[PDB]
Amino acid sequence: LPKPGTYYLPWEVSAGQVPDGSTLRTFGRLCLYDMIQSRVTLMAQHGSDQHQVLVCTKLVEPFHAQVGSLYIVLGELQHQQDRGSVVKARVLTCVEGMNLPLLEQAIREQRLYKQERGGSQ
Template sequence: MASSAIKSGALVALRDLHPSSQYYSQGTSLRVTGKLQEYSVETAIAIIADGSANLKINTQHIRDLNFRVGSIYQFIGELLIHTDNEAVLQARVGRNVDGMDLNLYHQSLRLLKQFQANQ
């Protein structure tokens, strides 16, 4: 059986995505969640935020997703690091997750990281 060329997106909170993070490297496959702050139809760039952390998302490959500022979205894609050390997620999947309890989501992420550390 051949292995898949596309890796699953590692669950990462936006506040944990910074230059010293293990996830902050070229081509890392990530799954991120945040509230849409801005969206440009011309550039297909969205900016999502979670607390004080934010991330640019390139949505050029996403179809049939209506972007609404203030809604919560989850994206899976590959991280691209530009020469100025700015990160942009090249999204391959996106979905609206309005109704998700972000506090409970962060709590489950913490528990998942604890479990993985103990394995």
């Protein structure tokens, strides 16, 4: 059995605020599909800032690509020497039309409740 997948907004993982080898699930919008090297570069906006996450895909071929669309990625993170941070994909589904603010508020509320229950112990 594997470890569970905790949610993480793109900008935190972009800054490397998670330990190496952790399992995380995040979101973003695809920007490029490097065919030969099996690499995916998705992007997510934050005000005037744009953040990039590198996704290895060696475990989900065959895989259709939808340029300029949202995605959900779940897997493990490995801190490479030069490439930086890349997530090893285990499941990679596509969702469209789902509004970000509801999701962001949802994880914020869940984190708040978890911390509140953590105040008794």
